Amino acid sequence: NATEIRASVGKMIDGIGRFYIQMCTELKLSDYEGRLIQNSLTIERMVLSAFDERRNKYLEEHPSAGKDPKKTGGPIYKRVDRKWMRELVLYDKEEIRRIWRQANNGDDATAGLTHMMIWHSNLNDTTYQRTRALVRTGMDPRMCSLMQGSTLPRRSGAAGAAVKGVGTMVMELIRMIKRGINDRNFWRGENGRKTRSAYERMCNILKGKFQTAAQRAMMDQVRESRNPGNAEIEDLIFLARSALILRGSVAHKSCLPACVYGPAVASGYDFEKEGYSLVGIDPFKLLQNSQVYSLIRPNENPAHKSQLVWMACNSAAFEDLRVLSFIRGTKVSPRGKLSTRGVQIASNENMDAMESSTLELRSRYWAIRTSVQANLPFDKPTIMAAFTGNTEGRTSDMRAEIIRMMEGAKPFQGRGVFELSDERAANPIVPSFDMSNEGSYFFGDNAEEYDNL
């Protein structure tokens, strides 16, 4: 039955590829332009926007985009006369839906839509900082390592919830509790009936992330308060600090852009026959064999733009850079040291100075998300953010119990490293880290804030 799952997962990969091929022909893109990752994001956005229908489930629409809600589109970049031309293409949302279902053999293929949504989420997680949003909800800006999927649309369903991190959940809960503090009729009426059910669902989702009995128990108390207020915010802040040391279980999905699945299908490949699994070597194979290009701005390092896209493709922004550096074969630097900005090009940017280069997406080893294990300590900003604020305010048997587990915490998902020549994962390789590299991707972070557009 395990190979039956591979066939269904391969069937949506086959569907994403078939669709992207049809969209390249529809937009009349050259072979190079079809492999340009800026075009891949725009084409992917048109699908999510066509099926979203202003729900904010698969993406987030600009307020200006709601000027003709029957159409969707974005910038398409073509190489004309030694320069990069940008044009805004518009299609009916009904047309994009028909083409998407036609590519998936009539099916609706919701899984494929989720797949491209999570790929956009992982790209935003590796690109943009979230410290201003953390400050708005009264959080520690040093908890940036807990913001997995903090860019997903607000009304993303169960599919989005699996990738959201502990801090992302605490942020959406505090946002909800603060709106209950403002309006007293929040938990009353028909809205009160539904919002209360959403509050208990979010709490139970966050409770599932925690891997200690003490953390789960404190989450139950936050759910039971039928009138939540400033006390539950403080408990959720404390549970977030505990997640720095007693890390939660968050799912990471390696979701590649359509411009990788596209030419894999375009050449000729039956992902439904061979099957496909996001957990093992299959994503590394597609990345090794892929040929992707990206628009690049002046004063930008194409090697760093590559690390940005490679890290997002493997959903590795929140992992140890010393591990990624070993797998990659090249030093994987913190985001602060990267000479790059977002992959997407803003509408106000000048196209005259824009160039393109080949993205380096290959790896020396591959790894399956999971026995000698060498454990590395947290950095001092993480330690200081975790063991603070417990001297004043709320104290309890549960808080003292959690702090006790944090203090005596023994050295939490890892990676099992294998050779590319070891396709069947026969001989695991024990990594040898470079102790001069920083361990956290967000150390010395200086990237743009996500709340700017």
The answer to whether the CB of 387 falls within 8 A of the CB of 227 is no
Structure tokens at 372: 């000698």
The answer to whether the CB of 171 falls within 8 A of the CB of 137 is yes
DSSP 379-432: PHHHHHHHS-S-SSS---HHHHHHHHHHHT------EEEEETT-TT--SPBPP-
Q: How many CB atoms lie within 10 A of CB 194?
A: 10
* CA neighbor of 303 nearest in space, from 252, 339, 264, 265: 339
Determine the distance from the C-alpha atom of residue 267 to the mean position of all C-alpha atoms in its chain, rounded to a whole number.
28
Measure the CA angle with vertex 284, ends 8 and 119; round to 5°: 65
* CA neighbor of 20 nearest in space, from 160, 157, 146, 116: 116
Structure tokens at 384: 């200081």
- Helix H or strand E encompassing 78: strand 71-80
Cα–Cα distance, 409 to 100 (Å, whole number) = 49
* CA neighbor of 34 nearest in space, from 391, 291, 411: 291
Please, what's the b/e burial string for 385-424 (b: 16 or more CB within 10 A of its CB; e: otherwise)? Answer: bbbeebeeeeeeebbebbbebbeeeeeeeebbbbeeeeee
Structure tokens at 97: 């839906």
Cα–Cα distance, 383 to 361 (Å, whole number) = 33
Structure tokens at 333: 């630097």
DSSP 263-288: HHHHH---HHHH---SSSSHHHHHHH
* CA neighbor of 312 nearest in space, from 332, 337, 289: 332
Describe the crossing of helices 321-328 and 302-313 by its angle, rounded to 10 degrees. Answer: 100
Please, what's the b/e burial string for 37-57 (b: 16 or more CB within 10 A of its CB; e: otherwise)? Answer: bbbbbbbbbbbbbbbbeeeeb
Determine the distance from the C-alpha atom of residue 43 to the mean position of all C-alpha atoms in its chain, rounded to a whole number.
18
Q: Where are the beta strands (DSSP E) in 241-393?
A: 293-296, 355-358, 365-369
Q: Where are the beta strands (DSSP E) in 175-324?
A: 293-296
Structure tokens at 392: 């004043």
Cα Rg of the chain, angstroms: 23
DSSP 147-173: -TTTTS-TT--HHHHTT--HHHHHHHH
- Helix H or strand E encompassing 37: helix 37-52
Q: What is the dihedral of CA 333, 252, 345, 90, to 10 degrees?
A: 170
Cα–Cα distance, 31 to 33 (Å, whole number) = 6
- Grouping H, G, I as helix, E, B as strand and the rest as coil, residue 334 is coil
Cα–Cα distance, 167 to 413 (Å, whole number) = 17
Query: Which residue type does 32 have?
Result: Y
The single residue listed with the structure tokens 């400033």 is 230
DSSP assignment letter at 314: T
First vs last C-alpha separation in the chain: 46
Structure tokens at 111: 């899984």
Structure tokens at 426: 């026969």
Query: Which residue type does 403 have?
Result: I
The answer to whether the CB of 293 falls within 8 A of the CB of 356 is yes
Cα–Cα distance, 353 to 375 (Å, whole number) = 46
- Grouping H, G, I as helix, E, B as strand and the rest as coil, residue 92 is strand
Burial class (CB in 10 A: 0-12, 13-18, 19+), 22: middle
Sign of CA dihedral 338, 343, 345, 350: positive
Q: Which residues pair with 417 in a beta bridge?
A: 367, 429
Cα–Cα distance, 175 to 408 (Å, whole number) = 32
